[PDB]
Amino acid sequence: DLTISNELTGEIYGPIEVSEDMALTDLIALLQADCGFDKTKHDLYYNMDILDSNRTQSLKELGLKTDDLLLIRGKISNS
C-alpha cells in the first residue's frame, strides 16, 4: 500500500500493492498513467524529497514498502 499524491492537482492515489520485485519504473508507469506523473515537468517526491535520474534504484533500492509514497510536484509554479 503505497501512497501517491498528486501535489499539483491535489489527488490522492490509493493503496498500491508494491512488491519489491516490481520495477520502480513500472511504478512510475502507473504513476504517469493514472497519477498524471510527468518527469519531464514534474518533480516526484519520495518520502520527503525529489527523485533524480540517478535514482534508477528501484522500489527495493529506494526503500519503498508498506508505508511508502510518491508525490507529484513540479511544473510551472513549484519547481
CB atoms within 10 A of CB 41: 9
Question: How many helices and strands, by DSSP H and E, does the chain display?
Answer: 2, 5
Whether the CB-CB separation of 15 and 38 falls below 8 Å is answered with no
Cα–chain-centroid distance for residue 77? 19
Convert 4-22 into a string of H (helix), E (strand) and C (coil). EEECCCCCEEEEECCCCCC
10 Å CB burial of residue 52 (0-12, 13-18, 19+) is: exposed
Method: NMR
Dig out the grid coordinates for 53 from the structure: 535520474
Dig out the grid coordinates for 57 from the structure: 534504484
CATH of region 1-79:
3.10.20.90
Question: Grid coordinates 510536484 are at which residue?
Answer: 73
